[PDB]
Amino acid sequence: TTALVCDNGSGLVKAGFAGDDAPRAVFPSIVGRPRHQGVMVGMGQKDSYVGDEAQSKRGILTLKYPIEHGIITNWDDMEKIWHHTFYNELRVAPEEHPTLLTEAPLNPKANREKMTQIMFETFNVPAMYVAIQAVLSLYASGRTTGIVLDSGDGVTHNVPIYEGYALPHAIMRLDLAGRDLTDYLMKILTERGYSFVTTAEREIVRDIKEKLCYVALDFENEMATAASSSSLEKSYELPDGQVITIGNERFRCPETLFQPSFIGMESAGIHETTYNSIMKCDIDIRKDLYANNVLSGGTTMYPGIADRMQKEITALAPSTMKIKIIAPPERKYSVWIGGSILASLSTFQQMWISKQEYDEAGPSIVHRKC
Amino acid sequence: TTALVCDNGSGLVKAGFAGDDAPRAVFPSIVGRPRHQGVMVGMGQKDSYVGDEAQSKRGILTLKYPIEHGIITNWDDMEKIWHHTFYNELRVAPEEHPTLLTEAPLNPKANREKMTQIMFETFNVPAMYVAIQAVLSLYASGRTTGIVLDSGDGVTHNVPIYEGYALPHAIMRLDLAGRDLTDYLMKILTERGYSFVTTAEREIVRDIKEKLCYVALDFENEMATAASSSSLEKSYELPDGQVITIGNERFRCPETLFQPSFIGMESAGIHETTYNSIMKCDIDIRKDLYANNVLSGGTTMYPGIADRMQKEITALAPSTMKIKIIAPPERKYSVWIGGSILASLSTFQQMWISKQEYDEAGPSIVHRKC
Amino acid sequence: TTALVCDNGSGLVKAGFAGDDAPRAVFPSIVGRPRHQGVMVGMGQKDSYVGDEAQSKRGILTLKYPIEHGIITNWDDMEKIWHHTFYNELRVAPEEHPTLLTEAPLNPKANREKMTQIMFETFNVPAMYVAIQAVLSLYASGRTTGIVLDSGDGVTHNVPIYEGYALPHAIMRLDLAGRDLTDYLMKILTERGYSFVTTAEREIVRDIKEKLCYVALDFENEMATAASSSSLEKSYELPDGQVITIGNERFRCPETLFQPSFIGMESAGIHETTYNSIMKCDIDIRKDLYANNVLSGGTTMYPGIADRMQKEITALAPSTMKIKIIAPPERKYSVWIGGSILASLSTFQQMWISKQEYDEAGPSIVHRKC
């Protein structure tokens, strides 16, 4: 029997069947509730909308993400999202399918305990399993060695692997991702006059970010160039007409990944935490880590991010190593692709957590063994 | 030579000389133009009236504020108001006094650039400077640490400051203030029969708001009490006789500050944005922020707003912190008082933007360095 | 003329006068610099704060230790810390006092060369001397024979002494100490939901470590006991409220000293390196070494560390020897106490490195004779 792969993420649910090339259902991980009165008697108003139905009706709803920084902070909303994913998007019965969920590294244990308890009780999956996103990304990249930099909507983390062995003491987790860049852009757009305060307006700004922002190779002279001429200015049209034009914001928004002090954080840029995670590894494997930086996730999709990353790491590493940033063109779904590959392996069918093991050991089995 | 302090605000100009205890000129920031015909030949009708001269000829004029939400949206009217402020209220020559202007945080750059250009070109000030209203409010409160909540006529904002260091990533700006409460009161008074639609009637309703409205410590049982008895009803006499009596409107008008959903806004109340701004600061300074909530501006002058604010923040914060709301009895002029203190400091006389620096750098001098 | 004792260490400066019973000044060896903006004109902004002044303002500063693993890796910051120690804490003139610095064994020569050059040039001490921490700890213990395990903030080392003769081929130096335990605890607390990433939060976690952590006599059954009941859970209150409760982390943190594989190190626990350093000595003195294990430094202050140490060494050594772990109650200042005793000896006054010897021989005089 086929299995389900349900990479959750903090901004997008990507589900599908183990053995496909791409996720079958990709929709926002969002729950909307009506905000206004409701006067038309007989309209049949729902209590809440999920997925991308809540996205087209977003004008009258208040949107909430049930996952903040990789952690599930609203379990009823997460249950709604899973119910939707199973019954309306994939149109299956969860009782007939093992499910491979995914989770960021180095986040609380109650998260996985609640995941597995929810699955086994309110969905009656025959078996399940909770992988780590970076490992699956490496599976999808077709490698067994490399330091993968995953950057989605909630959390950015490095995991260095060698020959299929993880270095759990060198795993570095950072908490600025797509959503903090969206908020920084919402804050930077006000200095031109545009004011986005609603959650629907946050979605609008997210789309502006996904369409017009890029990473400058050299930040300072890019700033000076944008100051001198006006060739960097593009235009965007809100969904009511009323075009807006942005200039240096285009590269000031994603630059925060390399100077997290823009949003008042004390951490270092992603280049520097990658270098530190490498320099925390055994001196023999780091020459092979330098040449297998695997970029993953949506927040790594800016134009020019691989070149800036390579420039920075080359400036940090010794002048003899060969820095290679590996950025596939489909790197936004690498975690799901690797998850499907993993759940399709024959030697994996003993790694599931069967219903009987859960019935014997309680929800605590998820990390105690698997 | 003495300097001028010209806290503009969106509802009231407060000007004076640096070194005084209180502003010398306080008049409405308003420009009126006649609507009707004009039949008496030789009456000598002016083209437009500004300040409180437009407030006495209110009945025949149409009033307009050149500042909407902290942003100057009519630069000719703002030029008129500044010309008035200098030549008729203060009765000075702007060519012989540096000028300290004030502005809310997180508003467009063109606002400051135009302020600077106007001052230097069409008033020939020797120097100028554009402070932030919250910093000056803290100066006037006599402390170097605290989260100040300024709420004037156009905009409400929090600025957390510690030991003289601002936390610009935790500044939160909200766009409901005195004027939105005035409009909500104009709309809520129609359910008793009173209909104010004119701009003059908007001024009347503003006076009603300043004289009869208060914040209820507990909104629900206050509502039930007003429903039960009639001990909350007061009476007001319009300027033609015609007494009006209002009941629960008295506390339903300023309640919007704590439930901005009454006017269809999605934001949170001022208590909740204050708490969020605090919880966005470093864990070591927020205990000292919890005990120095400084209130400022006119919209914080309702009877019982400090008690409700303290109750709400106490309900939100941990049960060990000491929540202290600092509400001086003169907090309506805190920005001007702090501005005079600042402009009087000896160590400040190098922070001015001299005319020569402007002539070198252009209007962009203002935010680029000062 | 009296002399100064300046046990530097990598986490705490302990200074005083030769002849006292305890260090006169004990403050963190830390230098903080402001990261945020600074708005209040005239607040008197300092460029950098040192010592425990940087500890109270740590909410707005970024803290840095100029000593990483016993090695001074920032000589400007170390010069700042020494200047502070002499002028603000001890309030003396370094030109009138010989200074006894201290260093860990088996660290680069340039460290001592730069120490003595700094002293003689930018402080003009009349003479100086650089001792070894373990020897001074043995002085303070009142012995001439024993294997001393010193464990501070940066480095752990054993030095076996017999009849006042060191065995330099049996000195073993290990590079996990208090700071690596603090980092491991910061990483282990994330699996309960608490997230400390800032340097100030690292100080908070250090205090949690110093208040709630202990060494379990038997790690496995202690683990099972913590899993069974909940009697091991204590609660801590962060400096903003927000009570946190930790369970088996209390003894999982210092257990790393006995299983350095928890932080991904390949070495052996402190018990095993102690036993190895003993078994590297001549077969006649090791019976007297077995009974004079002298613990020293702050990291040896966990409750129950002496008993675990004795149990482990007893299980390793032959079943006839008498293992005695000597753990004084003031063992956190043994190095300074012994240094004061040493600098007070009359026969020591010929071992100083006079200014004239340095002027003749260059900085290389320090290790070349003394």
């Binding site: - | 410590l217 019982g304 008690d307 109750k311 | -």
Partner: protein, 59 residues
């Protein structure tokens, strides 16, 4: 308003005070009994050490 506020708050303060006091005296009982227990363990250990050294001399 503020008076009844502070009154209810600090009556609850006296509530948690009574609770924390109960826990205090319970911890005092715990402390005294634990002193007695470690004292019994102290006589245990003194006796067993006397036995050990005597019988080891014998051996």
């Amino acid at each position: 308003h503020i008076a009844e506020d502070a009154d209810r708050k600090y009556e609850e303060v006296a509530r948690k005070l009574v609770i924390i006091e109960s826990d205090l005296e319970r911890a005092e009982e715990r402390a005294e009994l634990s002193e007695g227990k470690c004292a019994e363990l102290e006589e245990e250990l003194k006796t067993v050490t006397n036995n050990l050294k005597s019988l080891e001399a014998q051996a």
